[PDB]
Design an enzyme around this catalytic site. Structure first.
Site, PDB file in Angstrom:
ATOM      1  N   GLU A 132       1.957  10.224 -10.456  1.00  0.00           N
ATOM      2  CA  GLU A 132       3.301   9.545  -9.575  1.00  0.00           C
ATOM      3  C   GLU A 132       4.501  10.025 -10.372  1.00  0.00           C
ATOM      4  O   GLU A 132       5.348   9.740  -9.845  1.00  0.00           O
ATOM      5  CB  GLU A 132       3.856   8.140  -8.468  1.00  0.00           C
ATOM      6  CG  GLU A 132       3.799   7.852  -8.188  1.00  0.00           C
ATOM      7  CD  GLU A 132       3.546   6.289  -7.535  1.00  0.00           C
ATOM      8  OE1 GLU A 132       5.043   6.183  -7.961  1.00  0.00           O
ATOM      9  OE2 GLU A 132       3.004   5.389  -6.713  1.00  0.00           O
TER      10      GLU A 132
HETATM   11  C1  LIG Z   1      -1.614   6.663   1.445  1.00  0.00           C
HETATM   12  C2  LIG Z   1      -1.694   6.122   2.160  1.00  0.00           C
HETATM   13  O1  LIG Z   1      -0.900   5.491   0.340  1.00  0.00           O
HETATM   14  C3  LIG Z   1      -0.968   6.251  -0.385  1.00  0.00           C
HETATM   15  C4  LIG Z   1      -0.871   5.606  -1.480  1.00  0.00           C
HETATM   16  N1  LIG Z   1       0.982   5.710  -0.919  1.00  0.00           N
HETATM   17  C5  LIG Z   1       1.235   4.446  -2.120  1.00  0.00           C
HETATM   18  N2  LIG Z   1       1.138   4.550  -3.593  1.00  0.00           N
HETATM   19  C6  LIG Z   1       1.493   3.854  -4.372  1.00  0.00           C
HETATM   20  N3  LIG Z   1       2.832   3.575  -4.307  1.00  0.00           N
HETATM   21  C7  LIG Z   1       3.691   3.445  -3.536  1.00  0.00           C
HETATM   22  N4  LIG Z   1       4.699   2.837  -2.745  1.00  0.00           N
HETATM   23  C8  LIG Z   1       5.082   3.035  -1.216  1.00  0.00           C
HETATM   24  N5  LIG Z   1       3.154   3.890  -1.149  1.00  0.00           N
HETATM   25  C9  LIG Z   1       2.683   3.996  -2.298  1.00  0.00           C
HETATM   26  C10 LIG Z   1      -1.261   7.527   0.132  1.00  0.00           C
END
Ligand SMILES: c1coc(CNc2ncnc3nc[nH]c23)c1
EC number: 3.2.1.14
Length: 285
Positions: A132
């Site tokens: 990120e």
């Molecule tokens: C598909 C569904 O979730 C993801 C990873 N999303 C995610 N990663 C790290 N921090 C987050 N904060 C909100 N969504 C996040 C990809």
């Protein structure tokens, strides 16, 4: 395909239960342990789910270790996810990341180098790249070196990435273009390209079929699990889900749905949200 992937570890809902609790549900198939949030100098964070450490401070998680094994006995795949909002990670170059591949293999995989193992004798099924910090150095080289090391193991290993929907992704776009990746858990939320917004699934199909080094990469519809779980992009309409699912489920490139996160998707009712989606996948299937 019909797989549900869920991130687990960061306690988005507050009410996060043990990893094995979610594996003992019929509702999810792939679990991304969130996160190895510090590297190359190793550091893990699983919110309230692991508090003990080795003397040097690296998390030591015997409950999670037992749960990985339980999950795997039940047929689930459990990958360790690198990254997250810490941004306390970076590679200076490819050589450094290649050295780090060995470090991951020996620390979390079937490597025999005698490292401190946060998960004792448990062995992850692979690694997710949930980067990120908009710095792409080293990840493709890391993934590639991991693929060579996996041949020494005794089971199949998986690599995945967690881009946001804008294409190309500023943190894992290079990885996706230059390494052999099994799964793309694409966040169609918190962005213009949400399913309600300007849904850019077709770009990701073009990527899968023409760009991805692994032409058989599986694309996942990544969603918030609850209201709650994200600033924007949570869906209730069973609704577009059905149609969306229908729209996208025709291609061999469709792998399923990915949820942020288990604590949210399992507790949010609306019947648990994760259950609604599992059933839409099989029935739309
Ligand atoms: C598909 C569904 O979730 C993801 C990873 N999303 C995610 N990663 C790290 N921090 C987050 N904060 C909100 N969504 C996040 C990809």
């Amino acid at each position: 395909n019909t797989n549900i992937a869920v991130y687990w570890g960061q306690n988005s809902a507050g009410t996060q239960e043990s990893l094995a609790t979610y594996c003992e549900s019929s509702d999810a198939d792939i679990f991304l342990l969130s996160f190895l949030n510090q590297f190359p100098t190793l550091g893990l964070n699983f919110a309230n789910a692991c508090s003990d450490t080795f003397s040097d401070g690296l998390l030591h998680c015997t409950q999670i270790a037992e749960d990985i094994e339980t999950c795997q006995s039940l047929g689930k795949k459990v990958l360790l996810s690198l990254g997250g909002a810490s941004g306390s990670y970076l590679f200076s170059d490819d050589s450094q990341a290649e050295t780090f591949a060995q470090t991951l293999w020996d620390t979390f995989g079937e490597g025999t180098g005698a490292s401190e193992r946060p998960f004792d004798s448990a062995v992850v099924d692979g690694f997710d790249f949930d980067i990120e910090n908009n710095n792409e150095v080293g990840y493709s080289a890391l993934a590639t070196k991991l693929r060579t090391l996996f041949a020494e193991g005794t089971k199949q290993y998986y690599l995945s990435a967690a881009p946001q929907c804008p294409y190309p992704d500023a943190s894992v776009g290079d990885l996706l273009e230059n390494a052999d990746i099994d799964f793309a858990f694409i966040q169609f939320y918190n962005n213009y390209c949400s399913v309600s917004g300007q849904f850019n699934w077709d770009t990701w199909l073009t990527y899968a079929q023409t760009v991805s080094p692994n032409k058989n990469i599986k694309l996942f519809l990544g969603l918030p699990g609850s209201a709650s779980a994200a600033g924007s992009g949570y869906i209730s309409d069973t609704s577009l889900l059905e149609s969306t699912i229908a729209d996208i489920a025709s291609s061999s490139s469709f792998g399923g749905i990915a949820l942020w996160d288990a604590s949210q998707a399992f507790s949010n009712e609306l019947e648990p949200y994760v259950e609604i989606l599992k059933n839409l996948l099989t029935s739309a299937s």
